[PDB]
A paper describes a structure:
The mature VSG proteins are attached to the cell surface by a GPI-anchor, and consist of two main regions: (1) a large, N-terminal domain (NTD) of roughly 300–400 amino acids that is most distal to the membrane and (2) a smaller, membrane-proximal C-terminal domain (CTD) spanning 80–120 amino acids beneath the NTD that harbors the GPI-anchor. Therefore, at the heart of antigenic variation in the African trypanosome are the NTDs of the VSGs. These large subdomains are elongated folds centered on a three-helix bundle scaffold.
Of note is the fact that both structures were obtained with proteolytic removal of the bottom lobe (contained in the C-terminal region of the NTD sequence). Presumably these cleavage events in the crystallization experiments occurred from residual contaminating endogenous protease(s) from T. brucei (and/or possibly residual LysC for VSG545). In contrast, for VSG21 and VSG545, the cleavage in the crystallization drops produced a truncated NTD missing the bottom lobe sequence but maintaining the 3-helix bundle and top lobe of the protein. VSG21 and VSG545 are more similar to each other than these other VSGs, however, distinguished from them by the tightly twisted nature of the top lobe and, directly beneath it, the presence of a second three-stranded beta-sheet perpendicular to the axis of the 3-helix bundle. VSG21 and VSG545 align well to each other in the top lobe but not to the other VSGs with beta-sheet top lobes.
Author numbering:
A (entry chain A): 33 to 171, 192 to 252, 254 to 256, 260 to 298
B (entry chain B): 33 to 173, 192 to 253, 261 to 298
């Protein structure tokens, strides 16, 4: 559970989805094997003779009962399995978006003369910056959320009105000073990464406290309650035996 | 399609997922019917005599064979059904965030005297503002997708995402208008991100790569698997007794 970034949590959800689909396919394969065994055992028993023909028909009837019971259990487990699978992939996509959103920032503005800062093309604009991944994004459970960064409380601090005694100075390198002769903007990250934990199996998937972040805790909780249905359906699917 | 907001595309994809699960459950139920029919038909044919027995077992064997076929089809579609289902519910789960992040905005800063605007507690801070849904998000209390573009600041005075000058202190940009005066300083903020429409084609054409989040390559790779979802849905719709 080395979940340090939201992409790691999305890949962990991908691994859980892989194990769930593998369990479903194993149950379907056991049902197919029981049905094939029932058909072939019947067809072989038809050409046998005597008490061995009787024993072969008993085995064929047991195989057909096993096939019917397995298909019944799989059809019973299908709905909650699909529900939790859908909610799990929703959490995975939401973690993809929150991971690619963490690299957003407010670009720093170069200092300009104070007379040419509240008007004209030289206005000290606040410029958003989005940073999409270079190609393919994202390429005791832990999840993540987007929090608003708190702005700084002094001169040389993030998301503040930078001041300089000379114009054309970059906040990213030169430090800010208590001056109104030239005005600029010291930016910073627009969103910070908030951790969330949801420790899990009596017989239930924790409860993440609701916050003021995106996603809010109510949404993550509503998705976790369906993921619990998925894991219960997986425990039901594995319990079939052939 | 009637998709106008990013939150609506999630409900469209959810309806598509419900139709896919409906097709899956119908195929599994048809296999269940064939299996129970073969089982009970064999048990009845054992209780008969004469050609009426042979007439029944033949039919029972048919109910066996088709049953063995049905699972063989269903499992054969199960891989491709999942890879497209997951990505579908990925896209929906992404669209819930985009919509919920569309309300993000940079707050306005009340004007303050220039002498106390570049230092101390009285600095003009650029304060981020998130607006999460009061309860569950998106839950009250050719495709049409959406993505998050960057906002563009204005070019003059009294424009969005600019330094607001004013001749008097304690003025709020939401009510006061900015003026070319350096005596008092504040911030005229606005939305941090804008909506950006996205589209595909039913026959899935790779959407042009973006400068936005979600990236064009990511939504493209997910739309590639949604086609496998529809293929497995058709294969599940072509199995019957």
């Amino acid at each position: 559970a080395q979940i340090n970034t939201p992409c790691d949590a999305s890949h962990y959800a991908a691994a859980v989805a892989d194990n769930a689909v593998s369990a479903f396919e194993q149950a379907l394969g056991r049902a197919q094997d029981a049905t094939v065994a029932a058909n072939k055992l019947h067809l072989l028993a038809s050409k046998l003779a005597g008490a061995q023909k009787a024993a072969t028909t008993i085995l064929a009837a047991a195989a057909g009962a096993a096939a019917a019971d397995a298909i019944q259990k799989i059809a019973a487990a299908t709905p909650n399995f699909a529900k939790g699978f859908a909610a799990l992939n929703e959490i995975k996509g939401g973690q993809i978006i929150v991971d690619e959103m963490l690299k957003s920032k407010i670009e720093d503005a170069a200092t300009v003369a104070a007379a040419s800062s509240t008007s004209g093309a030289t206005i000290v604009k606040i410029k958003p910056k989005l940073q999409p991944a270079t190609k393919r994004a994202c390429h005791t459970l832990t999840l993540f959320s987007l929090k608003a960064e708190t702005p700084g409380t002094t001169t040389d601090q993030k998301l503040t009105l930078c001041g300089h005694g000379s114009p054309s100075q970059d906040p990213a390198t030169a430090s800010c000073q208590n001056s109104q002769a030239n005005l600029g903007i010291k930016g910073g990250s627009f969103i910070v990464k908030h951790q969330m934990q949801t420790t899990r199996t009596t017989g239930s998937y924790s409860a993440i406290a609701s916050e003021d972040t995106v996603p809010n805790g109510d949404t993550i909780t509503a998705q976790l309650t369906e993921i619990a249905k998925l894991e219960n359906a997986v425990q039901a699917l594995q319990n079939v035996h052939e």
